[PDB]
Amino acid sequence: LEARFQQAALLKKLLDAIKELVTDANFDCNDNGISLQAMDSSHVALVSMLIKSDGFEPYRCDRNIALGINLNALSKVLRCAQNEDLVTLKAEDTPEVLNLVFESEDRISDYDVKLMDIDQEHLGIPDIEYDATITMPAAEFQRITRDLLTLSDSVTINASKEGVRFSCKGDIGNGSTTLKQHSIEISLTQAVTLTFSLKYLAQFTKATPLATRVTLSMSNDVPLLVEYKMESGFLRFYLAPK
């Protein structure tokens, strides 16, 4: 395994989004790229990463490898890189250490992160027909979930012709913000109404700096899909309703 990124800031940002929610995970490396799929401690939410090999300069993974990593440890080490820097990931003899090298143009830093052993599993993600979907500024989805969380633990989300509606009830009082089809795109095939923990949605919005747009997809009694799309891949969160 040898993979190099143009910019170290985008690796930093991914880990910032994931690490609060997942402490340990396997990074599954292929010819197609590096991917990650994991649950939170409580099996309520699921994360799926994909950085395609397109987003690497000299990217090369001969055989298929799984790298078990504490994501805090990785984040600490990634903070030692400047945003401007050239990251290089290397994994050579044993899945016992992951090597990172940061450079610019101009000096060199390099670090080793101790790996661990995690288990293989396949939570199958039934791909499907989402009755309603919204896409909007990532910034605004962040603003709303931030603000609602200060009033209560849960939000309920209504999708209809009226537009899409986010509702609270808490001790302070209650209320709602609603968005219509103005940029905010909507597509409902039906109406859907579900309730979710704002603790989890707030953690998903740490992905805001990876993409200026975000996409929420729903169907009755089916986990919500929050998707942040990037070039050369994606980050996705699946959340079970209450």
Binding site: M39, V44, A45, G124, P126, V222, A240
Partner: peptide, 10 residues
């Protein structure tokens, strides 16, 4: 009260 993904297919 909250339910898990195992509850919705998975």
């Amino acid at each position: 009260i909250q339910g898990s993904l195992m509850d919705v297919g998975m």
